[PDB]
Every structure is written in structure tokens, then in C-alpha cells.
Amino acid sequence: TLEKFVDALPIPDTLKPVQQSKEKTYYEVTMEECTHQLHRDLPPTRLWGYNGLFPGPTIEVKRNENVYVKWMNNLPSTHFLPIDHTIHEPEVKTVVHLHGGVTPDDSDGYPEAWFSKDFEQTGPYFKREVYHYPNQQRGAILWYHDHAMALTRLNVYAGLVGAYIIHDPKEKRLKLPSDEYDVPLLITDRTINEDGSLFYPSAPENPSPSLPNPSIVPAFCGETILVNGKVWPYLEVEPRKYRFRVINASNTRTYNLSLDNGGDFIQIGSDGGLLPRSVKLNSFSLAPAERYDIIIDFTAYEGESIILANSAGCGGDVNPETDANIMQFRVTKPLAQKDESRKPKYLASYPSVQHERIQNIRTLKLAGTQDEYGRPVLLLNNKRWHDPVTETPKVGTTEIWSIINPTRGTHPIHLHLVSFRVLDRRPFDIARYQESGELSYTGPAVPPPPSEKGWKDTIQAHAGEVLRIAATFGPYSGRYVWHCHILEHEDYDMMRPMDITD
Ligand SMILES: CCn1/c(=N/N=c2\sc3cc(S(=O)(=O)O)ccc3n2CC)sc2cc(S(=O)(=O)O)ccc21
Ligand SMILES: [Cu+]
Ligand SMILES: [Cu+]
Ligand SMILES: [Cu+]
Ligand SMILES: [Cu+]
């Protein structure tokens, strides 16, 4: 296996606009098949990249900056990863979703607003080529990726991901580490063949001969961990405070991260922006699509090599030699200047300041059935994607969603458009729920830890629990989605439409 910590961490370039004025910023991003070396000892890997880059370029905006991005498909007409034709027209369909984006519906990248090369064919919900992001939201770490119906796991695995950072200039005063000392970390697990080509499985192992070929799989666990498009890389840092925007851009894998010298992370931010108060943590779980905005203070570790480690298994216990490792920091870079950054305690106003009336309470179950080939089909509330819409909140109103998970594992549940608050989690009797539908608690409600006291948009719903969240649906109305962000689940078929009505 590949030797750890021999390639420098790439820092993706910030995308430059094609046109910019005070009224409007316009970008163009083209999806391209490209080859890049993922490790010193591999031949170049054929990938699909935004502007031919993996990850895609980092886009940086200000709060309320009036942004447009023409996302274009210039990919080949055939995929290179295995497509299962029985879970759902051109073969290659793409659509770009800005995850976390407070976005009008027709710029949100609905799964059925896909487009093939040069927009030759378009899905039935396509309206526009040039997406509009008015960015009328809290400063935060967002990220962009493909969201095409029934291909999301493949197109994302192929390399279609990037970071998108919204900067609110009212946050400048906190003096958090900035510029060179503010670094995104997009984490993606991959399996890589000897010839350097990506491996994505064609079928579960020990395929029942009942199975079609290719067959979707319910979960994907990569052998190797990349950050910013390199296998187990190293970052030289100066002995001072750094901010990192940590984004789990992996298909299935959840990470549980720590520093091997026992140092602390200082979490300043969640999916939806700055927490009200910074939190000192030794470790943290980060499931697909969650983001953690953290300060790491390398001040006291000059000269040290410090591994960002991982304790969470994927399909097994972590292997100390492989997936127990993420990346390595080397505190050997000389100070370019005095560390004037800060790690304040007092970051933002609490979400609990808000007093909204509860218009409605939805009860949603995570469940599934079995198809004609014997495979698990994962379903939100026992509905298929294609069934008539049932989650129909009214614009401007607040709902509590109770999410009941009687399955064996966690699902990271994600709602488009909004960020939301975490109210609490509560264990329940699974066997009883499965036998009779009746909901009996085995213990009291647990409120969120401080990490979850701010704004979230992707939230881990653990097994044998009920999770309650509270969201205000707005400011736009329209047609959006909600889904498990395990892409293998999402595509079959753990994704529903969500209509925010007027
Ligand atoms: C429940 C969702 N889910 C999986 N489902 N797939 C299943 S469950 C299952 C049971 C049987 S049985 O009934 O014959 O026993 C046969 C086939 C099955 N398959 C098909 C292969 S695999 C998975 C891994 C992780 S992890 O990777 O994050 O640890 C997380 C969540 C996951
Ligand atoms: Cu996403
Ligand atoms: Cu999203
Ligand atoms: Cu799931
Ligand atoms: Cu989504």
C-alpha cells in the first residue's frame, strides 16, 4: 500500500470571475475529464473535474454578493464508472448543487434538472444554464458537487466536488486566522488500482447471481484517504494558529478525527456558520457532507509531525496502516509574520434567541424494502423518490421534524435550502417499533452537545434513536429535496422532494 505523507497538500486556487462589477459576479466552470497524479508513486488517474481540477476550484464570496455560475458539462458521452441501469436519455447527466446554498429553486441543482454535454438534452425540471447564488445567508463553509438523478454517487466519486466559502465582513473583527492561514480540507476516501485508475465497485462482494450487473451497492468504503486530491498528504505549517474548513466529501465514510500528539481542535463553526461559542474538542465525528470550521493552534508544537488520525471504521475497524490516517501536519515553516489571529470564545448570537412558533411537526421514518433482485432499497417514510410529494412546509414557517431511525446504522440527513437547530436525540425500542409501529422510549431526551448548538444542515441520525430538529423554511418557496447524504443510499432511493409552498 501507498506510503503515507510523501506529497504536499494541494491548496486549490481560488476561482477568478469571468466578469465582476459591484452589481454582479459571473463565473464559468466547465466539467472535464482530466488526469492527475493522486500519489508520488502512482501513474496519473483519469478523473472528472470542475475546470479539470480535483477538487474543483475554491470559490470565495461575500455575504449578499450577487453571484452567477454557469456550470457546463464538457465531459465524455460515456461514463467510466459502473452504471446500474435498474435503479431508475443520455448516459452522462450532470447537475451542480451548492450544498448549504440559500438558493432559488431552479439554481439549486435539482436531481432532475440535469443536463448532458453542452446542454444538448435536459431533464424535466431544467430551467436555466447560469445558476444564481444571491448568498443572503450567514458566512459559512459550503461545498459544491454533482447531484444528478441516480448518478450522484458515481459523478461525485469521479471527482466532482469543490469548496465554496461565504465571508461575512462583520466576522472580520473576531480576527480569526485568515488568508494563507485559512485552509480547506476536503476529505475523500478512494480505492485506487495498481495502474492508478479509480476503482468503484461493480457489484457487492459475493454477488447473488440474481443481481444485475452492474449493481449499485449500499455502501462504499475506500482503501485510501485523500485530502484535497492527494493520498495521505502532509502540510507544512508555521508554529501559530490556523483555521481549517473541514469538509467530508466522501460517498459513505464517516470520520472520527483526532491529533496524535493529543492536541485540541477549537471548533468555531458548523455547517450553517459560526457557533455562538467556541468549543475545545479532543475528537469529533464528521459524516458525509458535514463541515467543521476549526482552529488548530500549532504554537507549542514547533518541529513536530502531527498526524490527523481517524478512529471510525467503515465496513470494519480502521487499519492503523491505512484509513486510521488522514494527513500529517509538519510544524517546520518559519513565521512569515507575528500571529495576530485570535481564538475568541464569543463568536455569534445564539440560535435559541429566536422564538418561532411551531407551525407543524412531521414524523419521518428511515426504512426500506427489498427489490426483485434481493437488494435493500432505502426509503424515507416508505416512499420512493417518484411518489407524490409529502413534505410540503409553508414558506416562512417553522417545523419540528422527528426522524425515527430503526435501522442498524447512522444516516446523515440533509435538508436543502435551510439550516436548522438540533433539539434532542432519544433512544427507542426498535423491535417494538418494527412489530407494531408504536414508539416507546427507553431513556430521556439528550440535548445536543455544544458542537450542535449552532446551525446545521446535515445531521447524524443514529440507530435506535429519534432525532428532533427545528427548521424555518425560507426565505424562498419552490421545489427542493431532503435526503440521506450517504450517496449510495441517496441514489436508491433515500431521497424525497420537498415543496416549500406559498
Ligand atoms: C443498512 C445500510 N447499510 C448497508 N446496507 N446493506 C445491506 S444490509 C444487508 C443485510 C443482508 S442480510 O439480511 O442477508 O443479512 C444482506 C445484504 C445487505 N445489504 C446489502 C449488501 S451496508 C452499510 C455499511 C455502513 S458502514 O460501511 O458505514 O459501516 C453503513 C450503513 C450500511
Ligand atoms: Cu451535498
Ligand atoms: Cu444540499
Ligand atoms: Cu442513509
Ligand atoms: Cu442534496
UniProtKB/Swiss-Prot annotation:
Gene expressing this chain: cotA
Effect in UniProt of substituting residue 108 to A: 5-fold decrease in catalytic efficiency with ABTS as substrate. 785-fold decrease in catalytic efficiency with 2,6-DMP as substrate
Protein's organism: Bacillus subtilis (strain 168)
One Gene Ontology cellular component annotation held by this UniProt entry: outer membrane-bounded periplasmic space
GO biological process: sporulation resulting in formation of a cellular spore
Catalytic activity: 4 hydroquinone + O2 = 4 benzosemiquinone + 2 H2O; 2 (4Z,15Z)-bilirubin IXalpha + O2 = 2 biliverdin IXalpha + 2 H2O
Annotated residues for binding of Cu cation 3: 147, 416, 483
UniProt biotechnology annotation: When expressed on the surface of E.coli cells, CotA was shown to possess improved enzymatic properties, including higher thermal stability and stronger inhibitor tolerance. It has high enzymatic activity against three industrial dye types: an anthraquinone dye, Acid Blue 62, a triphenylmethane dye, Malachite Green, and an azo dye, Methyl Orange. It may help decrease the costs and simplify wastewater treatment, and therefore, surface-displayed CotA shows a great potential for industrial-scale dye decolorization. CotA is also a promising candidate for the clinical determination of direct bilirubin and total bilirubin, which are significant diagnostic marker of liver function and cancer.
Name of the protein in question: Laccase
